[PDB]
Design a protein around this ligand. Sequence first.
Ligand SMILES: CCCCC/C=C\C=C\[C@@H](O)CCCCCCCC(=O)O
Lengths: 55, 296, 310, 232, 214
Amino acid sequence: SIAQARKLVEQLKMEANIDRIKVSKAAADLMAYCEAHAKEDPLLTPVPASENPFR
Amino acid sequence: MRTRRTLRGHLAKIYAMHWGTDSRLLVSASQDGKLIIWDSYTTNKVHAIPLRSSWVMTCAYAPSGNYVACGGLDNICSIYNLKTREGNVRVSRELAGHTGYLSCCRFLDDNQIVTSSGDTTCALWDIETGQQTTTFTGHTGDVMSLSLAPDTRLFVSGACDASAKLWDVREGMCRQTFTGHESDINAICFFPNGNAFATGSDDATCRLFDLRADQELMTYSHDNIICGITSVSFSKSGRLLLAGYDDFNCNVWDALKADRAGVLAGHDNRVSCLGVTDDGMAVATGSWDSFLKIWN
Amino acid sequence: SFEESRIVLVVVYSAVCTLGVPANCLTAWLALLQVLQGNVLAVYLLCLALCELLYTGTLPLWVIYIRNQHRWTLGLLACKVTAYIFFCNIYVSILFLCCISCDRFVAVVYALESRGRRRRRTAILISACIFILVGIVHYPVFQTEDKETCFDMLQMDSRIAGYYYARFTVGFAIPLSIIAFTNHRIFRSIKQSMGLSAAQKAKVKHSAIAVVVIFLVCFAPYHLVLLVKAAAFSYYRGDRNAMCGLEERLYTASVVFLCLSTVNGVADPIIYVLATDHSRQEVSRIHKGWKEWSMKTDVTRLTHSRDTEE
Amino acid sequence: DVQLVESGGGLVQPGGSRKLSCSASGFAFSSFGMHWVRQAPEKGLEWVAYISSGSGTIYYADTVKGRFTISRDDPKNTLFLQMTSLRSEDTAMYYCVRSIYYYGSSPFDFWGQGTTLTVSSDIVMTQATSSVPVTPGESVSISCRSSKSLLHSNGNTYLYWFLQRPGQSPQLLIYRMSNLASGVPDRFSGSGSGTAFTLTISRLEAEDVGVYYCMQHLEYPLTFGAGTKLEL
Amino acid sequence: LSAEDKAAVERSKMIDRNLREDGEKAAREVKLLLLGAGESGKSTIVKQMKTGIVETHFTFKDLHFKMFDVGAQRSERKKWIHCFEGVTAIIFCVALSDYDLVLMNRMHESMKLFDSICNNKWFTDTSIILFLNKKDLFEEKILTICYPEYAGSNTYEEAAAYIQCQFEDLNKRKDTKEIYTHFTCSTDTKNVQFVFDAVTDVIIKNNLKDCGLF
Ligand SMILES: CCCCC/C=C\C=C\[C@@H](O)CCCCCCCC(=O)O
């Protein structure tokens, strides 16, 4: 099992170039994506019967 | 929050499902040996696929809709042409390059197909040659589920390592190492933005991640919830997280806050697969009680 | 004498009906509860429940309408319909017990053949044939009307009693032979099988013999007071109109036999939940669900109350 | 690919009966629904008969009821149709037609060679003119005028349009007003409102010559259009 | 609501009739789970009834037998063991002459596999059958190498009784489960006779539950 570590640790060192964001800005992506498609979201803003084809 | 139609499935059991691009048709996979393409509005099945290998655990519906992929533990992935001149369903080619059990097949493109297998590695396949172009290694556990981005360029897979590893499709290179799980990742799903993803596992804790952050934003856990998680899906606008559970009921948590927004207790059996349409009108739930049910 | 014994008997009929109605009413619903994940015996006991309590409930209805001293305020069309319900319910119940025993035999011995034949569609086929056979038997019964006393009668001719002896033979004796045949073959096929344990062997012996014994001890002595008619009326020694004591003793015997047969009729859905082992678990979880939706435990209410008082 | 060869289309005595059959090979005729279409010796396609995949539903036309019969054979993989009481209007160049039915299926996609049979209310659709002189390279349009609207309650209209190449089997151009058929160039494109309909022939060249037809698919008695010649 | 909808109804009825017929045809076959461990005599057992898992079909009298051989899976057992929840019988093969081979002797680890598979939650009530292998070699060579705890005679009958007794003592959460054991001679004509009588007894006892009798 000695050999299996070798290609593993370079697999760690090829992840030295981790892209970085801030978790508050990461969640800012999450919240800012919501209102873009919230006008077509039928779960929190369900479509009434005339625009609803699932009746 | 109530059932609008009940497909009632086909014969025995239901393991995986995949919503089509049309958002009207779904594919249903089961251990019986029949794959059924279903219609949501008319509650009428539109296709039936016999299987050479009865044991199947995954299904993929192509974004074009021309092809459907089914596979199992037989080490052979079968891609079927739905639209033929004959009108039948014929497997385009056998894909036998793995030494384990093909846990999840996904359709990046018509040409490029991503398969996750019990060989503890993933491989991009080309339908013309039946040969791996890029093989993604490093996952110590057997990769059980992969989630693909909308861009179809970067995808993540998850295994029995309690960890997730990102992959670049072009060069076969591990892009990120996510950790934080306490158990095997039963299922994984990608956020429709393409910037984040959240997972669930047998430790009854849903966990949110961002690809660039490589960090846990917040965990979704309840004391009464000891039941392990078998499926995860998202709404089109966020503010939602649909999640199957081992407690014989599905639950809906808020994406941002994870309150107990929706209690979903229709199915009597373990919710094997949970899928949401690409436009997001309805949620489809499938289980081994032979029943398929679509709610709104 | 006859009037007071009859009136206290029909009061006890009303009491037995009041004690027995919710059990059979719930029995139908439980049969519908199993019919989705149901075998052949599930829908057979469903049809048994749907054939039970209709006459058994409506008999006390016309009792409490007019306490029967042969008074008929109705046009007697309901009394003929009444008899059509009672006799047919008895015959379908007994031959249904015979056919469930036959299906037990064919399942235990011819186990390979049975699984294909145990579709629920094959279950609802023979039942209609049983009922239509009883209907052809009852068609002359409808025709042989003399516009006379139908509650009880006795005569030298015994034409009605001759038809009743024929109905006895075609409806009781051969069914008993079938029941005995299939149960003793169950006995032999169990004791020659060694894989099943001796305790389970004894338990199925006890259950099957218990069902056979209750069917015998209830319905068969009635059949004895039916079969006595052939000899007794044929020699005229068991038929004298002026010597009314014979009519008295046969009438008291018939009303006591009718009382115990109605007791067994009430007990048939009770037997449907008693003797089998699975019914203990199903009745236990039904009791748990009844307590759950009744909210009689009130333990969380008790916690809230002891928190509020302090 | 597929093979549809009709059998024994010949002379029939007036008022008599004759078995016609399209021998079939190379497709899942077990899972496919089948139609028949009549072609009078000069002008006019109109629908005749329907047999479904499961042989349960049988739909006939006004002059077709009773006097015709239809049948099939799954192990030998072929299709029969018997015609009795044959007169002058009963003579036509019948084409054996396959049509599978589900969401997004393309009915009336393939045709046979023909039946050379010579002896001796309803929705009304008419195309405006039956003759349009053209030039190889300029865009033209032809319009089929129905009598009632084809827009169903579900919001999807049912409307299939056909091209007939001179002397041979026809093709399907566009189905349900928006979907081009396979093997068809994109230069053909249907358009129009829910009641008025018109073609968009663009940059026509020397293979578009022939007669063009329209059809409704909102009522079971299907009736094609009159046909419009597109001469050079 | 037109000819297209009626035709879709006919096709949807058609495929359901085909599905029902195929399900009834498939339900007759008896499913068997083989769990051969290494040199447990897998080639021997497949000869006696005559890259993933290997499926085989053998017919005995009037009864069909589909058995799935899980061989060289090389994966975590839990993730796919439940796929065989509906199987009627689990056949186990164990070599008896592997009492002198240490990789942790093969017998002890085989016992651990049996303890794990018996004590699971999915197999609460599934009848367990186990076979033997290489018993003539075991009797010929024989004790102290693998089981000094026996402290008994090297007589084949006595030793084989001890070994089979200890293996049948692995009935954890097997109150409803049964352990049919067999002295497989490895040359006995039809050791499928044990399987047929065992599956017949299971079918009989489950038929009692189908009637609700037991
Ligand atoms: C012998 C003394 C006189 C009192 C009458 C004694 C018994 C009368 C006993 C009754 O079952 C007989 C009445 C005939 C009913 C016909 C039944 C028709 C049928 O259900 O098949």
